[PDB]
Amino acid sequence: SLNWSVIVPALVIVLATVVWGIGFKDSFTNFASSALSAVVDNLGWAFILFGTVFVFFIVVIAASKFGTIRLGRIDEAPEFRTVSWISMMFAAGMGIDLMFYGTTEPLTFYRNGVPGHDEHNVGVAMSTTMFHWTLHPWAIYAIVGLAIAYSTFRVGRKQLLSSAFVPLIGEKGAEGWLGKLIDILAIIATVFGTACSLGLGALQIGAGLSAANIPSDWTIVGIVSVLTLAFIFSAISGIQYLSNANMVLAALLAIFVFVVGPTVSILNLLPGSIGNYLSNFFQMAGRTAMSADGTAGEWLGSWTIFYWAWWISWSPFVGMFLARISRGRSIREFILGVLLVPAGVSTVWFSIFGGTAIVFEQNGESIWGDGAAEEQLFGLLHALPGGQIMGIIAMILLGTFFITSADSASTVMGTMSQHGQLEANKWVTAAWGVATAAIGLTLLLSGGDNALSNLQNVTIVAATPFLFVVIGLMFALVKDLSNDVIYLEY
Template identity: 55%
Template structure:
């Protein structure tokens, strides 16, 4: 059975087959090539089933005075409130947290698990073969480079801060309902709980936003805005007040999520300075000083244009982090770590349904634990999605949806598994052998307490502070560019004043969040992050519906659905009229049979137009006198 695009795809009678090329294969290959060219470069009015070139919008746009003005004013007001009346901010944040946990803690739990199911469904469905770019476009980066950049995105201040503190905390004080301290499975449960917070769930959250941005930018040529991904739902209204609100919520989420990360870094650097340099007793004053110095370093880098230098420092940071992990793996309890890896992974897989369903309905203890751990993490990850989503979208052009989801979920998850097994395993082994890491100061001090038990303790402690410092500067740089992009209507290179403003604002917000926690600065970070991230949960849920609507109208999906209807109609007609010997030809047909078949299988208007549309063409069947179907 031969398929032709009539009249352009008819065999060329003057064509002479190449040596070793059969006449039939020559004709078929030329037909396939013509089909490919017709699909990639359609002439005239673009049919929804054809892949149309949508250039990426890289224009420079002026500052959006509404988006920037409102968000900047609220950010400044928050900072003024925090510095002038820290106590009232702290009490207000605690009250807001109580209300959020009491009324919406379940929403964070259900939404995060829902995002995991959603991205896995998208990857496994018919949408998985859609290219994030034009049909047949090859990936912009080689797989090895793509994985390396994904690895760098998975590293950050969070892994440095929680690499030891979370596993050892769960080991010493197991999550509610998982047994008493010191039980036989405490180590496996501690690491499995940590993996729950750092593997599939957070990266599925990132994948939702990253996939929507990559599809809209590289497949549709839209601006790099969170609001642009809502065009399938809002249409032209996305450029009005609704779109501006979405972008403002994205800026707030990025601002407070980045500030939480920078606050963690400041806590850890202060702890290191107190241990290594003996600067004890300075408390929050030292925290504010650290944030001021690192923020100044970021401003200098932004003004001087040393983007390449920051990129070099970031790559160096990744190498140093790998060196630190490899060093601790070799000098630490290597065999214990290797044994812990498969056991913890198995426990994580077995306990995943239980951990995913844990909510405040199990009692006040569970609700308090969730606020400190799971819900805080889900809020933190959601607030980071504009930044991380844009990053992984930018490096994923040319990948299919299935490749994107697989890489985004698996690569960082494996990095987290190895990282926490090494650092958490070393701390748990010390705890089991009489070294009290769990009570070695606050969570920010536990990594330094662990390193103190191994060779080169001073060197590795300094290395940790250097790593955190560079993560601070490069993280503020990247997050500020994202906020600048959102403030300037999606421009890929926002102006320096806008970038600098958001960098300084991030440092100021981080300082306020730390101060609002009082003696327990970490509590201030967690409380405010959860409250601010709540509105963005609804944005992400709506984003899933918008993405599915986009994918359902993708040219590849339209072709598949239209072809299914057309071929079914053609085969029935061909067999009825000509038996085995029939061919399928594409030409203008006034019968409208395929259009009617399309309407029966696909809601909404037929993409070829109404039956009286003179430009519509359908599939017709004719007797094949040249090549029988049996061939």
């Protein structure tokens, strides 16, 4: 039974964008690049303040008595081995996002410097990206992951975000407004969040193509068309297979750069980027548009605030995944797992790519070149022996990522587009994929030169509504837990 009460109000907005954006582009590119400014100016304090509130909240919940509570029936144990569990989180924190920013993120920070500091600064270059890909995001994925796991396993509600809000709102199934609105926002967010990955991943393919068979905007459509097409072919079975073919390619690329690049230096950056990240954490936690001397405003809009929005928009999906994979875990074991494990991949993957990118800058090999993030990865690879064949596998890996990232995404979307049915309808899954690949393709076309700007801009806008929901999820979750049987028994 497809809950149309949600499917359509979320299809109105998804279509409206792929309507007043693709053809009627002027009003789109304009409205977007000003609406993004509206929220970053008056709501940046929100993304920032609550962004670190999540990391605290979630840590104190782990350390709380709630930690011993078991996501499932009383004294229930896990469905999988711990190491099997961990390896599903290692692969959980991997994909387009790390491909695209792995090289340019720390690079840009080193080359252009950071508000509150100066250029050519490794420590700050590294600890800043650590900031963007470690504790902060996964706290959000933990908040949403936990809320879902708890409501669907421990209390046996529907696997919908709306359900996690029962303690506060419900008010029955919280139906009508709110319950529907929460899940409606959950859908929208998931779409644009993944549309932001499918998008820039598609324009990292294009840039990669300029390293073999060889800017024509048409190609981007050509790219998306084939990938979104393979998405439909492989949505009839699969994800479990390619998500395993991803970890070989990715490991091949990383292990490659690690050996064939400045091995010792990359290694140096492990303790470095972790030691810096802990030293600067709160300084970074304290950067708003008021620093540095009312100057760090613009930067924050293009990094810290963007990411924050993107992480929050991707929490309905990633939250589902973790919950769906952590049944039987204690709340404490869950939190610590979701925080510490995924961040291991980030830390390493950035030290591998962004690490050698920094070393090339210092040694005059600079792979910057016109400063187009999209074509920086291949810039890196090419500077390494055998990096001409690696630059291709890098594309084939982005290709496979695109698909799987859209399989898993749409599954979760179908799941919440019909009363939280785990049994995903193979049609309502595909219907959400090509719909996501639409706005992914829309943000690319509507911008051209900028592209990446609007691709980051609108997601910042599609996410801001859902920020307040995650914020409320903190309240909906302390109530559930303090009303738990075990906690009332202790």
